[PDB]
Amino acid sequence: DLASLAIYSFWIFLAGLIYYLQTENMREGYPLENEDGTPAANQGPFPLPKPKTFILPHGRGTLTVPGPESEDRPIALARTAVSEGFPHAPTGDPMKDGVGPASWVARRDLPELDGHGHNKIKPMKAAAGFHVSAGKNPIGLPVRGCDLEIAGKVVDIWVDIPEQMARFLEVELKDGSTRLLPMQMVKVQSNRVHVNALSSDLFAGIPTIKSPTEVTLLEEDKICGYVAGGLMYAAPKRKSVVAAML
Amino acid sequence: ALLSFERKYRVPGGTLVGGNLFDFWVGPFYVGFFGVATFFFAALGIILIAWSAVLQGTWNPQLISVYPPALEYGLGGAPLAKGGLWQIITICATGAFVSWALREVEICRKLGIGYHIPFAFAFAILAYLTLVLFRPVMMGAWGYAFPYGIWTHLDWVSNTGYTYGNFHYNPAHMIAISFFFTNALALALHGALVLSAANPEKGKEMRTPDHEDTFFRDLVGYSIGTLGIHRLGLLLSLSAVFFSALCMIITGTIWFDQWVDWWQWWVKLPWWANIPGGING
Amino acid sequence: YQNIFSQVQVRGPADLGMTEDVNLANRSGVGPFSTLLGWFGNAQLGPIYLGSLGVLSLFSGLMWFFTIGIWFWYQAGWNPAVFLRDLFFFSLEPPAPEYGLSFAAPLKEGGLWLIASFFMFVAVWSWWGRTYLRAQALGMGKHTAWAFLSAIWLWMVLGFIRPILMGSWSEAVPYGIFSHLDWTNNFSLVHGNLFYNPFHGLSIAFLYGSALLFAMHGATILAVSRFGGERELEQIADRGTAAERAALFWRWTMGFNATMEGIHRWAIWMAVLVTLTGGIGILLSGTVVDNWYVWGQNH
Ligand code: BCL
Ligand code: BCL
Ligand code: BCL
Ligand SMILES: CC[C@H]1c2cc3[nH]c4c(c3C)C(=O)[C@H](C(=O)OC)c4c3nc(cc4[nH]c(cc(n2)[C@@H]1C)c(C(C)=O)c4C)[C@@H](C)[C@@H]3CCC(=O)OC/C=C(\C)CCC[C@H](C)CCC[C@H](C)CCCC(C)C
Ligand SMILES: CCCCCCCCCCCC[N+](C)(C)[O-]
Ligand SMILES: CCCCCCCCCCCC[N+](C)(C)[O-]
Ligand SMILES: [Cl-]
Ligand SMILES: [Fe+2]
Ligand SMILES: [Zn+2]
C-alpha cells in the first residue's frame, strides 16, 4: 500500500530531522560541565555537530561554532551543598560582581554597526533628522526610582537608527554625570519617568560608557544586566504599590 | 550537568512559596514548590487514568478513554466508574497546568526576565478550561465536556461540530482559523528571514538586520521590524486561541441551530432583503 | 512595562535600504509614515521593488481577481445591492465531470474557472521567482523561497495535481467564500472522514505546534528584550546575556533548549511541515485511498 509506505517513511524522516535540529542547537553551551567547571560524564545521546564558520562584516573577523567556551572572567559565587543541584550564593555584591539576574557576558567591546558600517545606536541629539513623532517625549522629565525618590532627569533619548526606535534614555544624576537606562525597563508617565527595577541610590552604580557618543555591546550587556538585577537585589528598598499610589 | 555559561545563573532566590526549601535543581530541571506540586498532580492524574483503563479492561493507548458524567448527572458528582474518575482527573490536569505556569514564573524571577511566557501559556489553559469547565457549566452538564482518549476526543469534535451542520459557518471559528493560518505563515517567514541573513550565499559575509528589512521591503513594500515580528507572532497565536474559546463558549449557550443559518441576518438587511435576483433573490 | 506597544515613537530620515546587487532603478519611492503602525512595529511604508517579474505577477494577479469579479457581477444581474448582499454566496465553479481535463467547457460552464485558474497559476509562480531573485540580489540564503514552496505544494495539489490524477477538472476547488468551505466539508465526507487520514492528523499537530512555538519564541524574545534580545543576528555572532537567559529559562523548565540561530530552524520546519504533510494527505485521497476509515481498519 502506497499510503502505508508513505506514513512509514515520514516517521523515519521526522526522527532524522529532530536529530538534526537538536544537534544543530548545540553550537553553543556544549560540552556540558559539572558545577566545578570540569567536563560532565553525561553529554546526552546527541553528538556535537561539525564546526561552521560565520564571516563577520566590517572587518570583525569570523565566528566558529562549536568552539571553546568564551566566558573566562571570575564568577563571584560559592557552592551551597556538597551534592550537585543546589544554589551557589554570591560571595560579595551580585550587582557589582555581575552574577544571578544581574549577569552580563563579555561581548565585543565595540558598537553594533548597521548595513553601512555606521553605529547602530546613537544619542538623538547627534542623529540627523530624528525627533519624537508620537507619545509623551521623556526628555526633560525627572526620573523616579522604586524607593520613590528622584534619581535624576532625562537629558536625551538614544535611538536605533536602522529600526527608528528608542532604546535607552540618557539620565543625568546629581553629580552632573549620566547613565543609560533601557527603554523596556522604564515607565514614561505624564510628569515623570518611573524605574521600578532600581532605587535612587543604585543609579550611580550603573555601569558607564567610555565615549559619550556611542555604546558598545559589552557596555550594553553590563548596563542591562545590572538594571534587571534590581528586581531581585533591590527588593528591600522597593516600596509597596499603596505607598507608590500616594 | 550545566551549560558552559550556566554557573553564574544558578543563584538563590525567586521562589514564590517555601523560601529555599525547594530552591534547587535535578539535572537540568529546576524544581521549586510548584515543581513538586506539578509532579503531584501529574502522578495522581496519570494513576487515576491507568485505573480507569482497568475498569475499562485494556492497556492499549489507542483504546483507553475516560468519559465525563452522562447528561443525567447534570453538574453533580458521579460514580468513579461513570464520570467521577473523569471529574477527579480534570481537577488534576488543571492543577498540573497552573502549577506549571507558576513554576515558570519562579524561573522568570530567578533569571530576571519578563513574565511573557507563563502569561502566554495561560491562554492555552483558559482554552482547555473553556471546553471542560466553562461551557459545560453554562450548558448545565459535565456531559458536554470531551473525553480523554486519543481517538475518542476526535469523535467528540466531529459529533459536536455536526450538531450544528457544517461548523465552518461559525463566525468566530472563521476568525480563529485566519489567525492560525496567518500565524503559520508568519512563523515560516520569520524563521526563513533570520536564517537567510545568518546563512547567506556560500563564502559571503553574514547579512545584517538592514538586509532583512530591505528584503521584505523590496518584496512587499513593508517591514514590521525585528521587535514587531516577535510581538506579531505572539499576538497571532494568542488571538487564534482566544477566538477558539469564543467560538465554542457561544455554541449551545446562545446559538443552538445550524450555524449556516446565522448568516441570514446579513441577507435579510432591509435595503436588499427582497430585491429579486442573485443567489438569495 | 511589557513592551507590547512602544511608549515613545521616534522618527528620522527615510531608509532606502541596502544596495548590494539590486537594480536600484526598479525600486519605487518611499511611502508615507504610519503613526498607527509605529506603535506596534516600524512606521515606514515602502519603498517596494518592482521589476518585470513583479509586474507580471501583479497583472495576472489582478486578472485572476477580475475574472472572479465579473462572474460574480453577472450572478448579481449587475445590481450593486444584490452583489453586496450575496457576495459570500457567489461561486465560480469548475467544468462538470463530463468535460474531463479538456479546455472545451463553455464560459459560463467552467471556462471562466479555467481562465481564472490560469491567471492565478502565473501570478503565484512568478511571485515565487520574485522571492528567489530579491534574495539573490542581496546575497542572502534562499530560505524564504524554499519555505514558500511548501505552501505552494498544498495549493498545487488541491487545484492541479490531484485533479489531473483524478482525470477531471471537476475535482478542483471553486472560487467562493462559502462555496470553498462547502467543498472542504464535502471532501471529508466523500473520503470517509479525514480525521482518519494520518497525514491530516500530522498537519493538525503542526498547525497547533506553530501557534505553540511562536507563542513560545515571541514571548521569550520580548521577555529578554530588556537585554536587546530581538537583535537576533548579533546575538548569533556574539552571544549575549539575552540569549543565555532565554536558553536557560527553557532548559530549567523542560530539560532542553535551543540557540539564537537554532530556534529559527525549529520554527521554519514546524510551519513548513504543516502544508508539506497536508499536501501528501490530500494527494493520497481519492487516488490511492477512497475511505480512510476503511484504510485505517487495515493498518
Ligand atoms: C467536523 C468538525 C468541524 C469543526 C468542529 C470544531 C469543534 C467542535 C471545536 C473546533 C475547534 C477548533 N477548530 Mg474546527 N471544525 C471543523 C474544521 C476546522 C478546520 C478546517 C481546515 O476545516 C480548521 C482549520 C479548524 C480549526 C479549529 C481551531 C480554531 C479550534 C481548535 C484549536 C484550539 O481550540 O486550540 C485550543 C488549545 C487547547 C484546548 C490546548 C490546551 C493544552 C493544555 C493547556 C496543556 C496540555 C499539556 C499536555 C497534557 C502535556 C502532556 C505532556 C507531554 C510531555 C507534552 N476547524 C469541522 C467543520 N472545531 C475547537 C475549539 O475552538 O476549541 C475551543 C473545538 O472545540
Ligand atoms: C484543540 C481542539 C480539540 C482537539 C482537536 C484535535 C484534532 C482534530 C486533532 C488533535 C490531535 C491531537 N490532540 Mg487534540 N484536541 C483537543 C484537546 C487536546 C488536549 C487538551 C489537554 O486540551 C490534548 C493534550 C490533546 C492532544 C492531542 C494530541 C494527542 C494530537 C496531536 C496534537 C499536537 O501535536 O498538538 C501540538 C502540540 C505539540 C506539537 C506539543 C507536543 C504535544 C504532545 C504530542 C501531546 C501528547 C498528549 C498525550 C498523548 C496525552 C496524554 C499524556 C499524559 C498521559 C497525560 N488534544 C481539543 C478538544 N486534536 C491530532 C491527532 O492526531 O489526534 C489523534 C488531530 O488530528
Ligand atoms: C468537515 C471538514 C473536515 C476537514 C477537511 C479538510 C480538508 C479538505 C483539507 C483540510 C486541511 C487541513 N485541516 Mg482539516 N478538516 C476537518 C477538521 C480539522 C480540524 C479540527 C476539527 O480541529 C483542524 C484543526 C483542521 C486543520 C487542518 C489544517 C492542518 C490543514 C490546512 C493546512 C493549511 O495551512 O492550509 C492553509 C494553507 C494553504 C491553503 C496554502 C495556500 C498557499 C497559496 C500559494 C496561497 C495563494 C494566495 C493567493 C495568491 C490569493 C491571495 C493573495 C493576497 C496577497 C492575500 N482540520 C474536518 C474533519 N481539512 C487541508 C489539508 O492539508 O489536509 C491534509 C485540506 O486540504
Ligand atoms: C495558547 C497558545 C498556544 C500554546 C502556548 C503554550 N503552550 C505552552 C506554553 C505556551 C506559551 C508553555 O510555556 C508550556 C511549555 O512548557 O511548553 C514547552 C506549554 C505547553 N503546551 C503543551 C501542550 C499543548 N499546547 C497546546 C496548544 C497551545 N499552546 C496554543 C496553540 C496543545 C494543543 C493540542 O494544541 C498541546 C497538546 C505542553 C507540551 C506544555 C505544557 C506542559 C505541562 O503543562 O506540563 C505539566 C503537566 C504534565 C507534564 C502532565 C499532566 C497530565 C494530566 C494530569 C493528564 C490529563 C489528560 C488530559 C486532560 C487529556 C489528554 C489526552 C488527549 C488525547 C485529549
Ligand atoms: C516540495 C516542497 C519542498 C518543501 C521543503 C522546503 C523546506 C524548507 C527548509 C528550510 C531550508 C533549510 N536549508 C538551509 C538547510 O536549506
Ligand atoms: C518537529 C515537531 C515535533 C512535533 C511532532 C508532533 C507529533 C504528534 C503526532 C500526532 C499525529 C499522529 N497521527 C495522526 C499521524 O497518527
Ligand atoms: Cl542554512
Ligand atoms: Fe526570532
Ligand atoms: Zn547607516
Report the distance separating Cα B39 and Cα B92, nearest Å. Answer: 10
Q: How many CB atoms lie within 10 A of CB C184?
A: 14
> Residue C134 is placed in which grid cell?
530579491
Torsional sign, CA C96, C98, C101, C103: negative
Report the distance separating Cα B219 and Cα B223, nearest Å. Answer: 10
Residues of B in contact with C236 (CB under 8 A): 198
Which amino acid is residue C289, in one-letter code? V
Which amino acid is residue A151, in one-letter code? A
- B187: Cβ below 6 Å to ligand 4? no
> Residue C54 is placed in which grid cell?
513583479
Element (H, E) at B117: helix B116-129
Report the distance separating Cα A218 and Cα A223, nearest Å. Answer: 9
Q: How many CB atoms lie within 10 A of CB B129?
A: 17
In angstroms, how far is CA C124 from the centroid of its own chain?
11
**How far apart are the CA of B123 and the nearest CA of chain C, in angstroms?**
10
> Residue C200 is placed in which grid cell?
491530516
Interval between CA C262 and ligand 8 midpoint (Å):
10
Across the interface, of A33, A99, A103, the residue whose CB is closest to B1 is: A33
Number of A–B residue contacts, CB under 8 Å:
113
Q: Are B132 and B249 in contact (CB under 8 A)?
A: no
Report the distance separating Cα A226 and Cα A93, nearest Å. Answer: 11
Query: Which chains does B contact via 3+ CB–CB distances below 8 A?
Result: A, C
Tell the residue nearest (CA) to atom 60 of ligand 2: C201
Element (H, E) at B88: helix B85-111
Domain C142-299 has CATH 1.20.85.10: yes
- Measured between its terminal Cα atoms, the distance across chain B in Å is 73
Partners of residue C9 on adjacent β-strands: A134, A165
3-class SS string, A160-176? ECCCCEEEEEEEECCCC
- Chain A residue closest in CA terms to B203: A55
CATH topology of domain B164-263: Photosynthetic Reaction Center, subunit M; domain 1 (1.20.85)
| CA proximity to B118, closest of B13, B16, B257, B26 | B16
Interval between CA C220 and ligand 9 midpoint (Å):
29
Report the distance separating Cα B222 and Cα C179, nearest Å. Answer: 33
- Chain B residue closest in CA terms to C151: B185
* Burial label, C152 (beta-carbon count in 10 A; 0-12, 13-18, 19+): middle
* Burial label, C186 (beta-carbon count in 10 A; 0-12, 13-18, 19+): exposed
Q: Are C103 and C115 in contact (CB under 8 A)?
A: no
Per the annotation, binding residues of B for (7R,8Z)-bacteriochlorophyll b are 153, 173
Q: Are B120 and B46 in contact (CB under 8 A)?
A: no
Q: Which positions ≥6 away from B228 have C-beta within 8 Å?
A: C40, C41, C42
Is there a cis peptide before residue A47, judged by omega within 30 degrees of 0?
A: no
| CA proximity to B185, closest of B240, B139, B132, B133 | B240
- What are φ and ψ of residue A54, in 5° steps? -95, 130
Written as one string, the DSSP assignment of B214-245 is HHHHHHHSB---HHHHHHHHHHHHHHHHHHHH
CATH topology of domain A2-106: Photosynthetic Reaction Center; Chain H, domain 1 (4.10.540)
C143 is in an annotated binding site: no
Report the distance separating Cα C110 and Cα C174, nearest Å. Answer: 10
Q: Which atom of ligand 6 is nearest to the CA of A14?
A: 1
Domain boundaries, chain A: 2-106, 107-239
Q: How many CB atoms lie within 10 A of CB A124?
A: 20
In angstroms, how far is CA B77 from the centroid of its own chain?
27
The CATH architecture annotation of domain B1-163 reads: Up-down Bundle (1.20)
Strands A193-195 and A142-145: parallel
Q: How many CB atoms lie within 10 A of CB C188?
A: 18
- Measured between its terminal Cα atoms, the distance across chain A in Å is 75
| CA proximity to C244, closest of C262, C226, C222, C229 | C229
- In this structure, the dihedral spanned by the alpha carbons of residues B142, B143, B145 and B147, taken in order and rounded to 10 degrees, is 120
Report the distance separating Cα C61 and Cα A79, nearest Å. Answer: 66
User: Which CATH number applies to C1-141?
Assistant: 1.20.85.10
- What are φ and ψ of residue A220, in 5° steps? -60, -45
C111-120 long-range contacts (CB < 8 A, ≥24 apart) are C112/C67, C112/C70, C112/C71, C113/C169, C113/C172, C113/C174, C113/C175, C114/C169, C115/C67, C116/C64, C116/C67, C116/C68, C116/C92, C116/C175, C117/C159, C117/C172, C119/C60, C119/C61, C119/C63, C119/C64, C119/C67, C120/C60, C120/C61, C120/C64
CA angle, A91 then A93 then A98, to 5°: 95
* Start and end residues for every CATH 1.20.85.10 domain found in chain B: 1-163, 164-263
Cell 496519570, residue?
B46
Q: Which positions ≥6 away from C251 have C-beta within 8 Å?
A: B3, B6, B28, C257
Q: Is C49 helix (H, G, I), strand (E, B) or coil?
A: strand
| CA proximity to A54, closest of C160, B202, C97, B22 | B202
Which amino acid is residue A189, in one-letter code? Q
Q: Which CA distances in Å does A180 have to A140, A169, C189?
A: 15, 6, 63
Cell 570583525, residue?
A60
Q: Can you state the angle between helices B116-129 and B226-249, rounded to 10 degrees?
A: 20
Residues of A in contact with C286 (CB under 8 A): none
| CA proximity to C31, closest of B227, A129, B217, B209 | B217
Written as one string, the DSSP assignment of C189-233 is HHTT-GGG-HHHHHHHHHHHHHHHHHHHHHHHHHHTGGGTTT-HH
> Residue A113 is placed in which grid cell?
554597526
Report the distance separating Cα A142 and Cα A234, nearest Å. Answer: 20
| CA proximity to C261, closest of B20, B94, A49 | A49
In angstroms, how far is CA C83 from the centroid of its own chain?
28
- In this structure, the dihedral spanned by the alpha carbons of residues C19, C23, C24 and C29, taken in order and rounded to 10 degrees, is -120
Q: Which atom of ligand 6 is nearest to the CA of A21?
A: 1
Alpha-helical runs (H) found in chain A: 2-24, 94-97, 217-233, 241-244
Instruction: Say what the resolution is, in angstroms.
Output: 2.5
Partners of residue C10 on adjacent β-strands: A132
Report the distance separating Cα B197 and Cα B206, nearest Å. Answer: 6
Report the distance separating Cα B65 and Cα A84, nearest Å. Answer: 41
Q: Is B111 helix (H, G, I), strand (E, B) or coil?
A: helix
Report the distance separating Cα C126 and Cα C94, nearest Å. Answer: 23
Report the distance separating Cα B20 and Cα A238, nearest Å. Answer: 21
> Residue B230 is placed in which grid cell?
516577535
Verify whether the Cβ–Cβ distance A161 to C12 is below 8 Å.
Answer: yes
Q: Are B198 and B207 in contact (CB under 8 A)?
A: yes
3-class SS string, C89-141? CCCECCCCHHHCCCCCCCHHHCHHHHHHHHHHHHHHHHHHHHHHHHHHCCCCC
Count Cα atoms within 13 angstroms, Cβ side, for B174.
Answer: 12
Interface test with B, best of A21, A32, A114 (most B CBs within 10 A): A32
Q: Is A144 helix (H, G, I), strand (E, B) or coil?
A: strand
Verify whether the Cβ–Cβ distance A6 to C284 is below 8 Å.
Answer: yes
> Residue B25 is placed in which grid cell?
535543581
Interval between CA C133 and ligand 6 midpoint (Å):
34
Provide the 8-state DSSP code for A121: E
Report the distance separating Cα B155 and Cα B146, nearest Å. Answer: 9
Report the distance separating Cα B93 and Cα B78, nearest Å. Answer: 18
Residues in chain C: 299
Across the interface, of B184, B271, B280, the residue whose CB is closest to C271 is: B184
- B121: Cβ below 6 Å to ligand 2? no
Q: Are A113 and A58 in contact (CB under 8 A)?
A: yes
> Residue A2 is placed in which grid cell?
502506497
> Residue A20 is placed in which grid cell?
538534526
Report the distance separating Cα C159 and Cα C180, nearest Å. Answer: 12
* Burial label, A176 (beta-carbon count in 10 A; 0-12, 13-18, 19+): exposed
Report the distance separating Cα C46 and Cα C57, nearest Å. Answer: 18
Verify whether the Cβ–Cβ distance A184 to C237 is below 8 Å.
Answer: no
Provide the 8-state DSSP code for A112: P
In angstroms, how far is CA B88 from the centroid of its own chain?
21
Element (H, E) at A193: strand A193-195
| CA proximity to C47, closest of B219, B227, A114 | B219
Interval between CA C230 and ligand 8 midpoint (Å):
7
- Break chain A down into helix, strand, coil percent, rounded to 5: 25, 25, 50
C191 is in an annotated binding site: no
Q: Are A183 and C7 in contact (CB under 8 A)?
A: yes
Count Cα atoms within 13 angstroms, Cβ side, for A43.
Answer: 11
Written as one string, the DSSP assignment of A229-241 is HHHHHTGGG---H
| CA proximity to C293, closest of C200, C183, C194 | C194
Q: Which CA distances in Å does B211 have to A46, A215, C264?
A: 34, 22, 17
Domain A107-239 has CATH 3.30.1490.20: no
Q: Is C282 helix (H, G, I), strand (E, B) or coil?
A: helix
3-class SS string, B10-41? CCCCCCCCCCCCCCCEECCEECCHHHHHHHHH
* Start and end residues for every CATH 1.20.85.10 domain found in chain C: 1-141, 142-299
Q: Are C37 and C5 in contact (CB under 8 A)?
A: no
Q: Which CA distances in Å does B39 have to B96, B103, B109?
A: 7, 11, 21
Residues of B in contact with A42 (CB under 8 A): 1
Q: Are B11 and A94 in contact (CB under 8 A)?
A: yes
Q: Is A220 helix (H, G, I), strand (E, B) or coil?
A: helix
